[PDB]
Design a protein around this ligand. Sequence first.
Ligand SMILES: N=C(N)c1ccc(CNC(=O)[C@@H]2CCCN2C(=O)COC2CCCC2)cc1
Ligand code: NA
Ligand code: NA
Lengths: 251, 27, 10
Amino acid sequence: IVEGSDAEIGMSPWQVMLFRKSPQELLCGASLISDRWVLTAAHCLLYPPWDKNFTENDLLVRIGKHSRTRYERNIEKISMLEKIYIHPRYNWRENLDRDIALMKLKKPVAFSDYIHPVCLPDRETAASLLQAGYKGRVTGWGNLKETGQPSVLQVVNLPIVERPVCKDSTRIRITDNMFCAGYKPDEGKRGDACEGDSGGPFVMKSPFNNRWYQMGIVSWGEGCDRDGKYGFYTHVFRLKKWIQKVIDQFG
Amino acid sequence: ADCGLRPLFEKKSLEDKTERELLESYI
Amino acid sequence: GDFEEIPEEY
Ligand SMILES: N=C(N)c1ccc(CNC(=O)[C@@H]2CCCN2C(=O)COC2CCCC2)cc1
Ligand code: NA
Ligand code: NA
């Protein structure tokens, strides 16, 4: 996260760290959507141009964390993967369309003050909150700058950007399964997601029921916090049918 | 279910330091 | 790593 701030304790209790077993380092962010399911970006797990292809046994999930590098004894929970599900139309070849994957945990995680699931949007919440200018929140342990790494979880609030501005900011083909967020040069303020923030949540607090909903997943961008460029997020509600099918079929 | 309600904030009626920035953008 | 070692159990 670039130009963000340190998170408060328990501010993002759905935040998940996907952690490489060997060598032990940060892989990506992710989110807790129930006591046994974690949502992340597909590219975190599979991305053939970079020879990236992780299997279940390659990884651990760390939940309830604040510190990036520390083992937070009596606070974090560390979980094993039962199974990974990648969207079958995930487009790694061209533009990261449908950049989403589910992970099932070997055992349910115990909720606590620091560990708690985020909501997934319904059609009406999505319609009312995914509007240009409305701000969401992105969190993660990734780089603080494009060209280092934070001591604790970072947070930044960013406005959703109009689809024409999103499209005109890049040569990449943008799809209905993505949205972009960030400030304009003219707006002054700045901030962005960056490498290592991948697969973490873009959340918004519904003013209707005061609950936090995950509307996006950190997916891609060109550089980090560049003027005239915007971060791109997987549109969670647009892929919700695949999400429900997986969880229903695989419980 | 109890999703999206944070034990150290919503469940205690405490607000974090910048959630009001989001609220104010919901125009 | 820059990372603290996790309990061997995991
Ligand atoms: N500035 C941001 N908002 C931002 C956020 C997340 C990331 C990490 N993700 C990545 O680096 C992803 C995965 C492989 C290529 N990639 C990219 O960002 C750049 O590659 C092209 C984007 C569309 C297809 C590929 C990079 C940047
Ligand atoms: Na364009
Ligand atoms: Na920018």
